Amino acid sequence: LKEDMKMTYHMDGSVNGHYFTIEGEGTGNPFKGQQTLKLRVTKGGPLPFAFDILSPTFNRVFTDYPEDMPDYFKQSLPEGYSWERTMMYDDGASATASARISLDKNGFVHKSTFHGENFPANGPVMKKKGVNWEPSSETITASDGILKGDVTMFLVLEGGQRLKALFQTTYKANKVVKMPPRHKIEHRLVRSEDGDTVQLQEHAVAKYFT
């Protein structure tokens, strides 16, 4: 690892049975928990839903961990880890996702999938009324060599509303690492658009409870 890393992204996904592919590149400082991504829809575009439902799928290596806390994700390198995720929305929509994080000569390789269903046809997701996720705090717990993450998510929508979702994730390293205590990761993710390339910026900091 170094302070200036590169990443590449490939996602195959679908939402309400409409399939798409996204590719892109990123840079970040994994020690400061900072990453900036540049993503392009290469098949199935333009997306007929709010991009925000995909953005958390696009890497806890980029988490600022305290020096004295075991860092599950950085320990996993160079082999890396994978995760599986469920996302349950307050409107009845639901989605699953998975990702595998590894390293080649250029930097991180991020390969993900996404499957979303039952987003209401006339609702803010399918009408593209997402703005940004509110900052959130994911609780991370350790058991039997794997981590589980739990976070209640609020998508800010146009017109002042919010849509709630429950995200649950299981993070699985390839090898045995030193396991952390129960803790939280504070996430701040911002999306920006320019009719060509979607930008995501995330800052993430791990901290002890209390």
Q: What is the resolution of this structure in A?
A: 2.0
CATH fold of 5-207 reads: Green Fluorescent Protein (2.40.155)
Burial class of 32 by CB neighbour count within 10 A (0 to 12, 13 to 18, 19+) = middle
- The coordinates were experimentally obtained by X-ray
d(CA 71, CA 197): 32
Q: Are 154 and 148 in contact (CB under 8 A)?
A: no
Domain ranges of the chain: 5-207
**Strands (DSSP E) along the chain, which ranges?**
5-15, 18-29, 34-43, 81-89, 94-103, 108-117, 130-133, 136-143, 146-157, 162-173, 183-192, 198-207
Q: Would you state the structure tokens that stand for residue 87, as one six-digit string? A: 């996302």
CA distance linking residue 189 with residue 171, whole number of Å: 20
